[PDB]
Design a protein around this nucleic acid. Structure first.
Ligand SMILES: [Mg+2]
Ligand SMILES: [Mg+2]
Ligand SMILES: [Mg+2]
Ligand SMILES: [Mg+2]
Ligand SMILES: [Mg+2]
Ligand SMILES: [Mg+2]
Ligand SMILES: [Mg+2]
Ligand SMILES: [Mg+2]
Ligand SMILES: [Mg+2]
Ligand SMILES: [Mg+2]
Ligand SMILES: [Mg+2]
Ligand SMILES: [Mg+2]
Ligand SMILES: [Mg+2]
Ligand SMILES: [Mg+2]
Lengths: 169, 298, 65, 156
RNA sequence: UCUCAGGAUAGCAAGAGCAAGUACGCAGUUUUAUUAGGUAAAGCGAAUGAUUAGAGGACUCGGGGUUCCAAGAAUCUCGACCUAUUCUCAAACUUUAAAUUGGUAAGAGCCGCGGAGUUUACUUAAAUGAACUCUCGGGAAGAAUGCAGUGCUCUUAGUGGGCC
RNA sequence: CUGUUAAACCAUAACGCAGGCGUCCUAAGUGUAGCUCAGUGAGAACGGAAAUCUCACGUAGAACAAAAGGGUAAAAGCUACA
RNA sequence: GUUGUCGGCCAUACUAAGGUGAAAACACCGGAUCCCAUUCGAACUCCGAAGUUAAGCGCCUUAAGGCUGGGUUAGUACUAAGGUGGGGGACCGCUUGGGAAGUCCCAGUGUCGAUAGCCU
């Protein structure tokens, strides 16, 4: 077996999403929380269907999500993973080679407390990609990446251990 | 897992156009472009293909024949090598140049050079020869931008300028030309600043860039410009603008096909091996017998 | 009341009785469905063509131009 | 029939042929048409404008006018025991060239050639085509396969 | 068509005529050339809709009963998911797809990117194209068979409950 | 007005089948651009059958005011703007 | 022999898991000051040149799925014309004409281009 440094395992994006199931000030609060964590502008996901138990009317503003790349999401992964004690479960790893973990108490990320800032829940999801991702994501001559280019679960766990010095159960 | 790709699925597949599954042609667009009024029965229709490469800027004049589409004139950015540019063949200026060359060539082929010069000094002002046409109308071409986005200040429009300045009629409204401004806040102005555009045609932007990179560090300037700087030195010039005015005048002056006189005879052995022929039925049979025995004795 | 609603029985034979009439092929055909652009062209290219014999006063007009 | 509308009973005639879904068919875009050519007229369902009435699908008309997006064609319809001329205007989409003349011209030119040459040699050549003709006498030397009528058997 | 026992209106019918009865014309016929069609059938280990049979299944989605000991594991029972199949079907299903049948044609008003013309918002960068004129070159007559029903005007009767 | 009866051009009856029309829309008309929907597998605090976020796969199985049939995938679908 | 660019036909081109990769191109690739662009320089846009065939892509491999063409099916089903044919009938069959489709077989698996090139 010959290996190119082309095979590098990269963090594609960290998506951090917060679902409050409400239209109101708590939303604006999670927005702020997110801006303050990312340095970017938060994205508002709507509420697609109506449910009485969840109090969600279709096309209603529901949740706040953020897409972060590079050193930002790197540094933050530092934050949350540490918040998670650098410990994950195999159930946390998908067949995409991409992993995710939950966090509550966003304060444990190192952000201050305000009445508008009351403690929030967050889903952290990490996409891992190899180098040729572009082929799939581009417009002209769009094509699907090769079998040898795509990242296996075992490979992803390996990435988490090898990089973060973490434990998996 | 329910198998969601069935035998059926395949019987039912509508195979898309070879050209569309390659992500090359936009047929909606293309049809829009090619349609001419059957009123002019057999009369040809001329489109300018601006195709950008991670290296070369290819500008062509094609028209649509049933069996095939035909190329009238082809300008490959590498011809700028012939005039002394080894690097940055994908830039705005490169587009401009290539377009100027395709222009002059077509115009020479027809015999319209004399009648049609273009604006020799470059402004950024709308330039279409169609205002001063007198005896023989300027050549008509349509811009085919292809899969590329129409973003304001796109290379394809560099080629645009190259070619209408070269003297071809290339209908354009200058709205997506670099240095065009549409204001939002108070509904202020439609601003055209030909200065920024021309500046971009010559590559002043690339120069200001060199300078920035120098300001920060030597490594910075090295990383992005290594080949570009050694190349700027080989022409013994201090700026891209002087080099591209050189390219401009040389192109304007003796633009022509450079015919490479190289004659090659028979060096094929290597890659005839890399490009295997398909196997005979007998061969597959043999394969089967082999796998069979290997299996049996195991 | 009761009636027979639609029968096409005798009508086919009736139609073949005297033959099926077909129109006459006329060298020159009417101009319906032909656009004015082309039509004006024809008008002009005829007016100016000397190899096409016009009326007398017409030729006077054509020869003056 | 209780309903009469431009598309009535158009279901399978106009549905695109199998795996024709969304075919643009650039060839029709490029076909050149002239005032005297013979056109065959065939509808496509994706292109709604300049749609002929179903009756005229698969008819052969003679071109009469040429408009920018459309060819004027000429067809005839038998009505009450008489023929009635109908001037159709078809959008380019639903039209294709008929080979009925192409065959003719090709044939003619070749034939004429033959006749001219023969005229050179004093031999009159005739281009008249004769239909299938009674078979000429023959001798046959072959292997005899003698068949006998089979007994009946039931296959269940 | 207040129209349903009626009226007009075409069609069918008679008489008087017109025209060179383009026979290279005509045809409820074939032949030949170019072409249409989704019916019959067939097909549902192919789409849509139904719809029986048994088995397997590393990997499965849940239920129940079994057992043990214990809450888990082992295991019987169900279906759902594939696995390889299988029974019988559709006018408002269909990939496939006939017979009978529909267009258009089978030359002097022919063929040939050969000529010279004509075109004042027709076409093209383009004497480019296009349409028509006068030219140049070639062209045994360009399938069988039949023609004691050639085409067209004019005026007008009866009919408009049908039946086998 | 659509699909059938209807018998592969067209045409074809019945108080024959199954349904639909006397409205609705300044956008649901028109144009440009970008995007790909239905659904399936695996994965992420509260989160539970079902809310959002991810990736892989998705011939079209979704959507297109209204009935049916046909038509549509860098669109006729979704988003934004004019 | 091989490449990019624009293609006509639109699976013999698609789907799956692999082998292979001269040259030149194409790409992956590096970077966000500038025109342009987003929640995010992922993409779109711009500027490049430290790496690399690992992706994409060419070419081939599978007693591969699919698709394409022939064979069987079968002169079977259906059908044109005739019948003072048979049968109580449903229906079947005689004379003269046309003539299919699935299981199962066997073969094939992209073709035609204009333009500029690589293989001295
Ligand atoms: Mg476009
Ligand atoms: Mg009559
Ligand atoms: Mg059809
Ligand atoms: Mg009475
Ligand atoms: Mg009367
Ligand atoms: Mg008489
Ligand atoms: Mg005769
Ligand atoms: Mg007949
Ligand atoms: Mg056919
Ligand atoms: Mg009627
Ligand atoms: Mg009703
Ligand atoms: Mg669009
Ligand atoms: Mg087959
Ligand atoms: Mg059978």
């Amino acid at each position: 077996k010959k290996e190119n440094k082309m095979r590098e395992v990269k963090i594609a994006k960290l998506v951090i999403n917060c679902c409050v199931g409400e239209s109101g000030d708590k939303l604006t609060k999670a927005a702020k929380v997110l801006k303050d964590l990312s340095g970017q502008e938060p994205v508002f996901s709507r509420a697609r269907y109506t449910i009485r138990s969840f109090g969600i009317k279709r096309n209603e503003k529901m949740a706040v999500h953020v897409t972060i790349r590079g050193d930002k999401a790197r540094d933050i992964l530092t934050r949350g993973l540490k918040v998670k004690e650098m410990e994950l479960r195999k159930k946390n790893f998908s067949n995409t080679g991409n992993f995710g973990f939950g966090i509550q108490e966003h304060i444990d990320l190192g952000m201050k407390y305000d009445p508008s800032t009351g403690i929030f829940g967050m889903d952290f999801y990490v996409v891992l990609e190899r180098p040729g991702t572009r082929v799939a994501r581009r417009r002209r001559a769009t094509s699907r990446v090769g079998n040898n280019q795509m990242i296996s679960k075992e490979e992803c766990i390996n990435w988490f251990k090898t990089e973060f010095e973490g434990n998996v159960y | 897992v329910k198998v969601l790709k069935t035998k059926a699925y395949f019987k039912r597949f509508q195979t898309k156009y070879r050209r569309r599954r390659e992500g090359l042609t936009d047929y909606y667009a293309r049809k829009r472009l090619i349609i001419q009024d059957k009123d002019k029965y057999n009369t040809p229709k001329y489109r300018l293909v601006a195709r950008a490469t991670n290296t070369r800027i290819i500008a062509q004049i094609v028209y649509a024949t049933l069996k095939c589409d035909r190329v009238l004139c082809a300008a490959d950015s590498y011809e700028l090598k012939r005039f002394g540019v080894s690097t940055g063949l994908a830039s705005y200026a490169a587009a401009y140049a290539t377009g100027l060359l395709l222009a002059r060539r077509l115009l020479k082929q027809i015999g319209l050079d004399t009648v049609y010069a273009g604006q020799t000094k470059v402004d950024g002002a709308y330039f279409n020869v169609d205002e001063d046409q007198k005896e023989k109308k300027p050549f008509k071409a349509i811009l085919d931008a292809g899969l590329v986005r129409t973003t304001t200040g796109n290379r394809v429009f560099g080629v645009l300028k190259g070619a209408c300045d070269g003297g071809i009629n290339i209908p354009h409204s200058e709205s997506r030309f670099p240095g065009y401004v549409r204001a939002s806040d108070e509904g202020e102005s439609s601003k055209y600043k030909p200065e920024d555009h021309k500046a971009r045609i010559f590559g002043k932007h690339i120069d200001a860039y060199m300078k920035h990179l120098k300001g920060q560090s030597n490594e910075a300037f090295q990383k992005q410009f290594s080949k570009w700087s050694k190349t700027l030195e080989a022409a013994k010039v201090d700026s891209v603008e002087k080099l591209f005015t050189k390219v401009h005048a040389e192109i304007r002056k003796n633009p022509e096909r450079v015919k490479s006189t190289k004659k090659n005879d028979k060096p094929k052995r290597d890659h005839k091996k890399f490009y295997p022929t398909k196997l005979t039925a007998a061969q597959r049979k043999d394969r089967v017998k082999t796998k069979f025995q290997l299996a049996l004795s195991q | 009341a009761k009636s027979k609603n639609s029968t096409n029985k005798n009508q086919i034979s009736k139609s073949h009785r005297n033959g099926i009439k077909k129109p006459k092929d006329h060298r020159h055909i009417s101009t319906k469905g032909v656009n004015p652009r082309f039509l004006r062209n024809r008008r002009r290219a005829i007016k100016n063509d000397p190899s096409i014999k016009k009326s007398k006063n017409l030729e006077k007009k054509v020869n003056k131009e | 029939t209780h309903s009469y509308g431009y598309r009535r009973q158009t279901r399978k005639k106009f549905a695109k042929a199998y795996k024709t879904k969304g075919h643009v068919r650039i060839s029709r875009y490029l076909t050149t048409y002239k005032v005297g050519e013979y056109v065959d007229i065939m509808v496509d369902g994706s292109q709604h404008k300049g749609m002929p009435y179903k009756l005229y699908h698969g008819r052969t008309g003679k071109v009469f006018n040429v408009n920018p997006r459309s060819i004027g064609v000429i067809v005839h319809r038998i009505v009450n025991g008489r023929y009635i001329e109908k001037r159709l205007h078809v959008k380019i989409e639903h039209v294709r060239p008929s080979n009925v003349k192409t065959a003719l011209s090709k044939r003619y030119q070749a034939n004429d050639q033959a006749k001219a040459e023969g005229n050179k040699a004093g031999k009159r050549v005739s281009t008249k085509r004769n239909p299938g003709q009674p078979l000429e006498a023959v001798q046959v030397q072959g292997a005899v396969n003698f068949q006998h009528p089979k007994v009946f058997r039931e296959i269940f």
